[PDB]
Amino acid sequence: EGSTYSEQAVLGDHASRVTRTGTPLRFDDRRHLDAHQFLIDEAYLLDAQEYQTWLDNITDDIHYLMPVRVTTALNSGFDTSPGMAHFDENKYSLSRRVARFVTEHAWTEDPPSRLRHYITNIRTFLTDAEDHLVVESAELLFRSRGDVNESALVSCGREDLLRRVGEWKLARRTIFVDESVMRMQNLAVFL
Amino acid sequence: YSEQAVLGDHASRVTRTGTPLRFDDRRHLDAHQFLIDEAYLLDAQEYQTWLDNITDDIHYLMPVRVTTALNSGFDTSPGMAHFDENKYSLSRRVARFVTEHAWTEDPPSRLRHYITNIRTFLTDAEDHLVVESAELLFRSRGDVNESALVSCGREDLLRRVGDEWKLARRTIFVDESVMRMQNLAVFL
Amino acid sequence: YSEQAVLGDHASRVTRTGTPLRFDDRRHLDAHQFLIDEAYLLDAQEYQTWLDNITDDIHYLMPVRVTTALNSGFDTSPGMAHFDENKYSLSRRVARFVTEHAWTEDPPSRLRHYITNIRTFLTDAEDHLVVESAELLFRSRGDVNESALVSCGREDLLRRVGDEWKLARRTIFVDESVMRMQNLAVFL
Amino acid sequence: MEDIRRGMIPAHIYNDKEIFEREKATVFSRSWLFVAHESEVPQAGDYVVRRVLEDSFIISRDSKGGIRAMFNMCLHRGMQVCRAEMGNASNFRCPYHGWSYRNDGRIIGLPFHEEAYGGEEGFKKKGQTLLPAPNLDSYNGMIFINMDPNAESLSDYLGDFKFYLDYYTKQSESGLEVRGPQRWRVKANWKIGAENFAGDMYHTPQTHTSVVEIGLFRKRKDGATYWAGPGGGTTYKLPDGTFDERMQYVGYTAEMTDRAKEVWSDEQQRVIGADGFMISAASVFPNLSFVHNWPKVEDGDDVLPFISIRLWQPISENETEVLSFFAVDRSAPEEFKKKSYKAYLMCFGSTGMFEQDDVENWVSLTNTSAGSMARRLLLNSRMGLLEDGTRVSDELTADEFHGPGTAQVGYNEANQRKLLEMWADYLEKPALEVGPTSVGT
Amino acid sequence: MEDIRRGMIPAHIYNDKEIFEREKATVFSRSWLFVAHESEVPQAGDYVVRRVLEDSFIISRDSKGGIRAMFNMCLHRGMQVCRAEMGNASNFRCPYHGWSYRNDGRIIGLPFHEEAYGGEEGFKKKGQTLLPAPNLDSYNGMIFINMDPNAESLSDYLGDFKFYLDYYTKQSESGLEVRGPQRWRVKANWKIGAENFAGDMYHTPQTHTSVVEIGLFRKRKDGATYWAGPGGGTTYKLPDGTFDERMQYVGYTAEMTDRAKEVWSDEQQRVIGADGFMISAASVFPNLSFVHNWPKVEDVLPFISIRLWQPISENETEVLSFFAVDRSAPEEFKKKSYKAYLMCFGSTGMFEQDDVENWVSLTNTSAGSMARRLLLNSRMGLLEDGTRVSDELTADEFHGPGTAQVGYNEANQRKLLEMWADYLEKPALEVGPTSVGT
Amino acid sequence: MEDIRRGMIPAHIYNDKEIFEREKATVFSRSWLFVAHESEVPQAGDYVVRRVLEDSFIISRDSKGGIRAMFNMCLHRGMQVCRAEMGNASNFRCPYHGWSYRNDGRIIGLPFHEEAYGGEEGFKKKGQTLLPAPNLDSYNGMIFINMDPNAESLSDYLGDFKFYLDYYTKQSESGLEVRGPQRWRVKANWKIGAENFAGDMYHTPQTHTSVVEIGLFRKRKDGATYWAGPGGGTTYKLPDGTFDERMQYVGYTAEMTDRAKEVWSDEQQRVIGADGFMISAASVFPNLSFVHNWPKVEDGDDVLPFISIRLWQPISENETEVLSFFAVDRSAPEEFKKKSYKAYLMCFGSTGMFEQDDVENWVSLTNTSAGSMARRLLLNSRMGLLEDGTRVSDELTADEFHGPGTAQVGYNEANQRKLLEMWADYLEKPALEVGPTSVGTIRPLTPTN
Ligand code: FES
Ligand code: FES
Ligand code: FES
Ligand SMILES: [Fe+2]
Ligand SMILES: [Fe+2]
Ligand SMILES: [Fe+2]
């Protein structure tokens, strides 16, 4: 319906509508440096699978969304499955997902994967609201589990909304997955 | 490499000097900022915007690499590149995507130019930096085939033109002898 | 991991403190500049130069990873590494390539050590940093086989020696149990 | 082979190249196989491209409201005539030599037909179309393809199973709304998933404890498992109550409950209303599966149901592409559709927290089927049968169960047995043979 | 099989494991297959390593200017004696146990021959060499290998086609200069490209609009398609004019035109001079292909490309694309020619880009079980009763050997597949094993 | 096939899919194949999971000291019951339906056995276990599996070879300590490595110059090559000396040399002591190999030995997984172990500077075996034989060589010939046929260390 992916997302009604303005900040600009420091620390949390810590860096009005991508013709005006996403999460769903890992009864991840979230191509934007940044990144996930199967890649882009609360926190995440058909056993991870 | 390229006669000969700039050096921060913004352009296939960031005397070159013995003194196919382009050819290539009749890219690939390992050098000319980067291109198209990687290193010559940096030379060292991608209907 | 390693008795025990430094902190910027310069060295296979940025008490360690259950309290092959090197062994490894009679690397590989996710810590000793990076190595050799990825994390200990930083410890957390490369006739 | 008929399963059937090559010329050449729902192409010109194994088909809606399936192939030299996954077009140009097709399949442009081919005597153009699927049919808007040109109809095939199918797929005169799919490759044999959904209640407590423990849900053995025609399924026993009490106890609104009664039979109602069995999971032979569950809602202690349709598309003896769809009645409240989808995403599909652990089970089983030990093992699928062939427990009577086919209560392996019985029946069929079409004649 | 002979193509032949296995034991075991040009190893010691499917051969120039092809294998326990793609060496050491070979093949070092093997009686070293290719030959410096030790000669195979091949590969007494190849893997059956270049004019308008539109070029149906011996090709009709005018209209300088007449016959001249047909694309059975075009310059200037369709599987090909130009061409001409090459064909070619999309997409449909039920129509040019749509060009209209026509047609594809089927029915090549060291 | 028996090798046997499938049904269906050492599971509940080709086995230690191998499969619907490579557990839960098994294999939990299966008449639980390997045995603590349920015993199979195996694996009454494995994939046929280690001295000068040149080492033709039973090996000729002198000359301590004499027989001693042949490499049919070397130590000119045990696990016709282990006598000084391992890391295994080059050679030979030329070549492996079949040099006499089997000095290819003769004998055996087990219608192994 809308024209972010966040606005088109079925469960994106309560999501923050803050958007970017200006060109990107310089790479010595304090706000950029903060954003960068944030995304790299996340990465180390997500590698170690510190999902409780990670969640405390996520606002209570978070929209965490990664739509299904579909291959489409050039002037079709879309490239995601209408009304279908891989992830379309609020804070409650995200925390209940993490709760799951915490029970240690999430069999598909005992034993655990080996995760390496590679983060690159970071760049920051001022927004149309006070305590808010827009951060684009590229994230390549490398994953390996057990002693038979080859490892999987997952390539994506992200637009994030960061929000100042005392510390920076994650208010919106839109993941642009670079594959139509995923090649991973599951998405019992986070991007 | 630019000097050995068949079509490199008109190419800028500026080269690095000294050791790499610190990572808080303004001139490094600009060079980095440039390369990440290019990536965003090349992902979105904004080839026209991209093309306006490229000087009119560009040499854009990516030789064919060949596996050779240690003291052979060359590792590229003599007189044969993947890309050996000036501004004319690069624009006519982009013009082609602009027609929307470039069938191999309708539907479009899904592209992710990852850029890493950036470092910057002062040159032997006024308004010129040399910038090294590593680039890993991930590419997926359609709903059957597995995705391709392309790995490469780059040396770039950026040149100051007004309040803006621009690309004057690009040498792409591709990390494969035989390419595993359907085509090179993309840019690096 | 350096303490559990069989040949880690002589290794530096300095560890991190505080939270990570800001990305404009001079010390972070030095550490970053270092890892990126190493990368360009390891790509060009300049193993001698590389070796001069390594302290004489280096522990350079890459354990075997093994898939284990959640509360097992280890994830490496007890008493077995891929690399467990000191300066002496690292240099003899390099001496070997220098001979040019290391057949498995003549012709050479094509290497690209992608370094990302760099973050720095103050330590509990004076002239010492702890530097975390992710490293993805892409490697192609010859004109038949597919290229190989090696993913890993590293914790490094940097040490100030004159006007220069040097590598005193490296622990490599390889992201695979079973390696898919012909060899590790490279460095990470 | 005789072993399957005694409920003993040669473990090698889930990772054997030869059995796959065979399955392809039998099961997948002679079955009705799901490709899409109608509701996925509502407008004129709307299309999805879906596959029967490695065969690509354009499913599109014409400008009269009708639906067609067209082999995705230009009639000249083979090029696929539509290389996107979905979209909207009124025609399809082939970029090789510029032949073009109306979206109902009728050829339009054939350049130099007169000058170069010599007109109709050289190549037949008059009333040519993109090739139709060998056989196409549908039921409740669910569109199937069969590769056998002489198959029975989809309705003859599905038989009494349409009775159960309806609960999933016809809850109103308005029809069904389906979205998706999410698509992802798993290293498990297509068969294991279908069996699970067909009649595996036994797994639920163990595999999915995590999902009970995190409080996502508000007697498992008390459920009924049923089989009818080519399909079968699982159910939950509800507390005492009427049809409206029980529908509502499961999260359906009164007006949705009322619209249900307009399209369900007295019998169909009685299974929920009197017997108190509510659909859970089901499979249709060979590779179509359903699940219906009602987790607790986010803000409080009510429950709300979701429906998933999924296709186990086979890639090899040891790889499947899961296509998971979300489905909900077209007339349900807009708030209801959002919640139902939310539960869906959390429970099944590419990020489902049930599916995660199910696929682990199946992938692991695929792993043991790989070795040489697996060609020496008969796994045991005989739960509900004693050693002398007598039943452990009894069939449900017509008084206790009002739906067609046979039903029981308790954990059992009856439906797995029947699925694999069907599999064996199909493996022994002769290879389908079909005369070659000479395109242009 | 009887279908191919009627111009109807079983759809599954472009993605069938069994047919690939068969092809390997027939087509690729019995044909002359290109590997390299002389000009790629000009100096003594120069070598390239090139493959015939999965067999590795060293093609090297010796120190008398001669050329050899040696199976890339140490005679001891089979290690490859040369693990680089190209370079310059006067000998090849084997690192396994240190046997060494002159670059003409003759063995030099065989350590402890006497003490270990027991001399000649234990192992034959006297006048041994790296194994020769089963059959080696060349034409216009183009070097071919044939795996059948009893093949006919290359000249005999190529027959009348040498007349056309000469336009692409002998424009001067100086010989040809080829560079490359660009190498990349595509998910398309090897045959589809061979067919395309053999005689597909039809595709050009539609596939390559993008390239006209961008003004890269300055009557397509008016071109002749010819077939002679085991190959065939496409051509462009040129405006009226003499040999020199027409050669020049296409981008050849005057002194290049003059050098051409030294090596081309009157008959080879008349095809350009009188008939007005200039080579475009061509294929030689099975997997060798040529293209000649003259885009606008950054005036027009021609480029040539030679390419091998090396088959990897039933659904994968390695394209090896070469640039070629006459050696005596002006240095400026060479640079412009190559620039057009890079822009049109090869690993970055804007033509090839779209051509490979077509082929790749065909290979996709060939994958399924529907493919095993379709015969595609390749009968353009033929009516239902078997009568020709249009007539053969007469000897007055066309002065080159074989048979020719004008207009869009599918004659050449039909003949290439006919050859493919004649070869697929041959019996498996059988060759006595060599016992190395006897 | 008759060609092998003449020491002429059809080139295609190293990259041929049909021959691999055949090997699988013969060689790998009938042979004792190594999985693990006892010292890798010292305590109760310790376990490794190891693979015979694509079959997964839990090798675990029970709470009485005994060792079991169990097929890694739940008895219900076939899910692997342990999804880690190693660890410690006194039971394994299956997460599909919750059946549970003690670590000696015996079933504990079977949910709703009574209500759902109908008790014992429905499914047999009483005294059930995870399935035993078809055949299990060990020697010097090295545990083997054999998929033929009617194979001969390991000891029968190994025969006279145990004489040599003891040099590598029984240096004390304390037993052996093996650690590892390092595991990595190489694109080389399993066979080539096995043949190399079986008796390729000839390669060493050329392949491994780099390692001498860098001064990591302190007459190669003078070594003996020996073959007994199903295995063979290489050795180094040592300077004149007694048993203690020659063991010491190679880096063993004196108390280590003494502890060896407690377990080696007079004959086993005499081969080192009198004959002056110290073990180097060795292979056991089909895919087990050993290497024993003594490089110079870091801080000085002493030398110190290391041992490696490796399995060549075959993945396809053109891929192998190397499983490299380190091994040292359990009673060796703690300082000796560290140095021995250091040398091991430098020389063999995933980062070995020898192995690097050896694997190059093999991978490259696999490459030539791929093509159609290789189906028309017989490679020559006749070194040591003349054209009329007469020997180049003589057997060593009983006075010159005191160990069982046969042995010569000089570069030769006798052991490769004998390894391939075995391969051929195996390849012509009939398909093993085994009645199917209907699940539901283990003898602890005594330690040997
Ligand atoms: S294949 Fe479509 S026009 Fe030729
Ligand atoms: S393989 Fe070349 S000398 Fe042995
Ligand atoms: S398969 Fe393990 S308990 Fe069911
Ligand atoms: Fe489940
Ligand atoms: Fe073309
Ligand atoms: Fe060796």
Automatic annotation (TrEMBL), chains B, C:
GO terms, molecular function: dioxygenase activity
A biological process term (GO) from this entry: 3-phenylpropionate catabolic process
Segments forming a coiled coil: none
Keyword vocabulary terms for this entry: Dioxygenase, Oxidoreductase, Plasmid
Family assignment from sequence similarity: Belongs to the bacterial ring-hydroxylating dioxygenase beta subunit family.
UniProt xrefs under PANTHER family: 3-PHENYLPROPIONATE_CINNAMIC ACID DIOXYGENASE SUBUNIT BETA, BLR3401 PROTEIN
Protein name according to UniProt: Phthalate 3,4-dioxygenase beta subunit
Species annotation: Rhodococcus jostii (strain RHA1)
Name of the coding gene: padAb1
Automatic annotation (TrEMBL), chain D:
Principal EC category: oxidoreductase
InterPro entries: ARHD_Rieske_2Fe_2S (IPR015881), RHO_NdoB-like_C (IPR043266), Rieske_2Fe-2S (IPR017941), Rieske_2Fe-2S_sf (IPR036922), Ring_hydroxy_dOase_asu_C_dom (IPR015879), Rng_hydr_dOase-A (IPR001663)
Molecular function in Gene Ontology: 2 iron, 2 sulfur cluster binding; dioxygenase activity; iron ion binding; monooxygenase activity; oxidoreductase activity, acting on paired donors, with incorporation or reduction of molecular oxygen
Species this chain originates from: Rhodococcus jostii (strain RHA1)
Coiled-coil positions: none
Binding site for [2Fe-2S] cluster: C74, H76, R77, M79, C94, H97, W99
Residues annotated to bind Fe(2+): H203, H208, D358
Top-level taxon of the source organism: Bacteria
Keyword match Membrane: no
EC number(s) from the headed UniProt entry: 1.14.12.-
Keyword terms, alphabetized: 2Fe-2S, Aromatic hydrocarbons catabolism, Dioxygenase, Iron, Iron-sulfur, Metal-binding, NAD, Oxidoreductase, Plasmid
UniProt keyword Iron-sulfur present: yes
UniProt similarity note: Belongs to the bacterial ring-hydroxylating dioxygenase alpha subunit family.
Annotated gene: padAa
Domain Rieske residues, every copy: 32-145
One Pfam family cited in the UniProt record for this chain: Ring_hydroxyl_A
Name used for this protein in its record: Phthalate 3,4-dioxygenase alpha subunit
UniProtKB/TrEMBL annotation, chain E:
Protein name: Phthalate 3,4-dioxygenase alpha subunit
Binding-site positions, [2Fe-2S] cluster: C74, H76, R77, M79, C94, H97, W99
Keywords: 2Fe-2S, Aromatic hydrocarbons catabolism, Dioxygenase, Iron, Iron-sulfur, Metal-binding, NAD, Oxidoreductase, Plasmid
Lineage of the organism: Bacteria, Bacillati, Actinomycetota, Actinomycetes, Mycobacteriales
Top-level division of the source organism's lineage: Bacteria
UniProt binding sites for Fe(2+): H203, H208, D355
A GO term, aspect molecular function: oxidoreductase activity, acting on paired donors, with incorporation or reduction of molecular oxygen
Encoding gene (name): padAa
Similarity field: Belongs to the bacterial ring-hydroxylating dioxygenase alpha subunit family.
Source organism (scientific name): Rhodococcus jostii (strain RHA1)
Enzyme class name: oxidoreductase
UniProt-listed InterPro entries: ARHD_Rieske_2Fe_2S (IPR015881), RHO_NdoB-like_C (IPR043266), Rieske_2Fe-2S (IPR017941), Rieske_2Fe-2S_sf (IPR036922), Ring_hydroxy_dOase_asu_C_dom (IPR015879), Rng_hydr_dOase-A (IPR001663)
Enzyme Commission number(s) of this protein: 1.14.12.-
Rieske domain span: 32-145
From TrEMBL, chain F:
Binding of [2Fe-2S] cluster, residues: C74, H76, R77, M79, C94, H97, W99
Pfam families in the cross-refs: Rieske, Ring_hydroxyl_A
Family: Belongs to the bacterial ring-hydroxylating dioxygenase alpha subunit family.
Official protein name in the record: Phthalate 3,4-dioxygenase alpha subunit
Rieske domain mapped to chain residues: 32-145
Entry keywords, A to Z: 2Fe-2S, Aromatic hydrocarbons catabolism, Dioxygenase, Iron, Iron-sulfur, Metal-binding, NAD, Oxidoreductase, Plasmid
Enzyme class, first EC level, given as a word: oxidoreductase
Gene name in the database record: padAa
This protein's record includes keyword Transferase: no
This protein's record includes keyword Transmembrane helix: no
EC number(s) given by UniProt: 1.14.12.-
Record GO terms (molecular function): 2 iron, 2 sulfur cluster binding; dioxygenase activity; iron ion binding; monooxygenase activity; oxidoreductase activity, acting on paired donors, with incorporation or reduction of molecular oxygen
SUPFAM superfamilies, per database record: Bet v1-like, ISP domain
Residues that, per the record, bind Fe(2+): H203, H208, D358
Entry-linked PANTHER family: 3-PHENYLPROPIONATE_CINNAMIC ACID DIOXYGENASE SUBUNIT ALPHA, CHOLINE MONOOXYGENASE, CHLOROPLASTIC
InterPro entries: ARHD_Rieske_2Fe_2S (IPR015881), RHO_NdoB-like_C (IPR043266), Rieske_2Fe-2S (IPR017941), Rieske_2Fe-2S_sf (IPR036922), Ring_hydroxy_dOase_asu_C_dom (IPR015879), Rng_hydr_dOase-A (IPR001663)
